[PDB]
C-alpha cells in the first residue's frame, strides 16, 4: 500500500513532492531513502515506505503527516489538503 499527499499544487512538481516526502521522513527520523517509488500524480505525491531503522510503518507515516500538517505546511510553503493510505 502506498501513502499520499494531495495538495494545493497542480501539477505538483516532481522536485517539490521529493521536498515534501523528505519534510515527513525528517519529523519521523528516518532517511529519504527509506521512501521508495515517489511518484507525483497531478496534485498528489505518492510513496511507499520500506522497512527500516526506526520501524516506521506506511500508517506511522500517515498519522506524522496528518498530526504536523500546519508544520509541514510552513516548512514546504504549501497546503495541505488530503492524506491518507491507498487500496488495491
Same mark, same amino acid.
Given at each position: $500500500?502506498? +501513502?499520499?499527499?494531495?495538495?494545493?499544487?497542480?501539477?505538483?512538481?516532481?522536485? @517539490? +513532492?521529493?521536498?515534501?516526502? @523528505?519534510?515527513?521522513?525528517?519529523?519521523?527520523?528516518?532517511? /529519504?531513502? $527509506?521512501?521508495?517509488? =515517489? @511518484?507525483? &500524480?497531478?496534485?498528489? =505525491?505518492?510513496?511507499?515506505?520500506?522497512?527500516?531503522?526506526?520501524? =516506521?510503518?506506511?500508517?506511522? =507515516?500517515?498519522?506524522?503527516?496528518?498530526?504536523?500538517?500546519?508544520? &509541514?505546511? @510552513?516548512? /514546504? +510553503? &504549501?497546503?495541505? &489538503?488530503?492524506? +491518507?493510505?491507498?487500496?488495491?
Amino acid at each position: $500500500a502506498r +501513502g499520499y499527499i494531495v495538495t494545493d499544487r497542480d501539477p505538483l512538481r516532481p522536485e @517539490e +513532492g521529493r521536498r515534501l516526502v @523528505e519534510d515527513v521522513a525528517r519529523l519521523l527520523q528516518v532517511p /529519504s531513502s $527509506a521512501f521508495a517509488d =515517489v @511518484e507525483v &500524480l497531478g496534485p498528489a =505525491v505518492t510513496f511507499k515506505v520500506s522497512a527500516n531503522v526506526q520501524n =516506521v510503518t506506511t500508517e506511522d =507515516v500517515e498519522k506524522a503527516t496528518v498530526d504536523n500538517k500546519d508544520k &509541514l505546511e @510552513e516548512t /514546504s +510553503g &504549501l497546503k495541505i &489538503l488530503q492524506t +491518507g493510505v491507498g487500496s488495491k
